[PDB]
Amino acid sequence: YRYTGKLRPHYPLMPTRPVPSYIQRPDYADHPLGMSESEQALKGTSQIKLLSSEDIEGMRLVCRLAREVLDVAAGMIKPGVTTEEIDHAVHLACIARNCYPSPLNYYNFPKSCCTSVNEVICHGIPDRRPLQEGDIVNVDITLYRNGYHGDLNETFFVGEVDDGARKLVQTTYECLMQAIDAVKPGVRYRELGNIIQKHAQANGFSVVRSYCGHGIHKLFHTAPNVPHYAKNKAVGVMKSGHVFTIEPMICEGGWQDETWPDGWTAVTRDGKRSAQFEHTLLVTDTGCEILTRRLDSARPHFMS
Numbered sequence: 001y002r003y004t005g006k007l008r009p010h011y012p013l014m015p016t017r018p019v020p021s022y023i024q025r026p027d028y029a030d031h032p033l034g035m036s037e038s039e040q041a042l043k044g045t046s047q048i049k050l051l052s053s054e055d056i057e058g059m060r061l062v063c064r065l066a067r068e069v070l071d072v073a074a075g076m077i078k079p080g081v082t083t084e085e086i087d088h089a090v091h092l093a094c095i096a097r098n099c100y101p102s103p104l105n106y107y108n109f110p111k112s113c114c115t116s117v118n119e120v121i122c123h124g125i126p127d128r129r130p131l132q133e134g135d136i137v138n139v140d141i142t143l144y145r146n147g148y149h150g151d152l153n154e155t156f157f158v159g160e161v162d163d164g165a166r167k168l169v170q171t172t173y174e175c176l177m178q179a180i181d182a183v184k185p186g187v188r189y190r191e192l193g194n195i196i197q198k199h200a201q202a203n204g205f206s207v208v209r210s211y212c213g214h215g216i217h218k219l220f221h222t223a224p225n226v227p228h229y230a231k232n233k234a235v236g237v238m239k240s241g242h243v244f245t246i247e248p249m250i251c252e253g254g255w256q257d258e259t260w261p262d263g264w265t266a267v268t269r270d271g272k273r274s275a276q277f278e279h280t281l282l283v284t285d286t287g288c289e290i291l292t293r294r295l296d297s298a299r300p301h302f303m304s
């Protein structure tokens with residue numbers, strides 16, 4: 001395998017971290033290939049759940065806890081810390097909140113969160129590499145509590161980064177907030193990609209195509225599929241009570257992606273950097289509630 005960039009995996013990994021049995025587990029947790037029967041049963045559906053009041057409550061809760069966990073990870077980012085060390089802390093932080101780390105054994109993913117450095121677009125596996133000055137690192141958290149998943153990510157700066165890293169991460173965050181700001185009943189899920197690409201392109205960046213935002217609630221990934229690029233053919237119209245993510249991945253170079261032989265780690269084919277931000281959103285009568293919002297600050301961690 002020819003690596004697209006300078007990054008390499010740093011194995012071996014620490015043995016699988018156990019989750020105490022008193023933590024409620026999603027269905028895939030103990031499937032041998034980490035497949036989710038509830039997802040399998042609904043695969044290919046276009047129908048979007050309308051959440052009940054109790055659902056909304058469970059989504060608010062798990063998304064607030066997920067935010068707390070991301071905030072733990074953010075506080076650890078600095079040169080020298082390994083992504084594996086972040087994942088350990090995250091795993092403990094989930095358990096400490098009576099939650100299961102959704103990524104863990106999701107389709108056999110080996111860790112409890114995704115850590116994506118520089119040219120990793122998404123789904124990077126926490127490993128023994130210490131973060132280096134000038135890196136950008138995204139940590140993507142999902143927790144599972146009482147039958148509900150809550151999903152968010154942020155890109156972070158490791159020490160001083162260069163002007164291109166600043167611009168990439170700022171622009172990515174802007175893309176996200178501009179898409180969120182359009183969300184309300186009656187808007188077509190496909191329009192979000194128009195808004196994202198218009199902003200990325202204005203700033204000299206491309207938009208990943210192979211990964212999309214998604215519905216989330218009792219299932220980790222379900223309807224709707226939400227592409228982040230212009231003129232896509234997503235199906236569906238936003239309605240009050242819909243819950244989904246928007247998670248644009250934006251790149252310095254070209255948009256094309258490939259996967260490492262680990263089956264997960266998605267990288268730019270050109271080996272240039274990519275950044276991402278993600279929130280879980282609930283469509284309300286008037287607009288949208290950002291379930292995974294930071295509560296103790298108006299801003300993401302990279303600004304502050």
Ligand SMILES: CCCC(CCC)[C@H](N)P(=O)(O)O
Nearest residue numbers: 103106109140141142151247
């Ligand atoms: C280990 C998996 C975790 C992953 C989804 C996997 C398909 C992310 N939270 P995503 O939905 O890409 O934001």
Ligand SMILES: [Co+2]
Nearest residue numbers: 140151152278
């Ligand atoms: Co995520």
Ligand SMILES: [Co+2]
Nearest residue numbers: 151245247278
């Ligand atoms: Co997601």
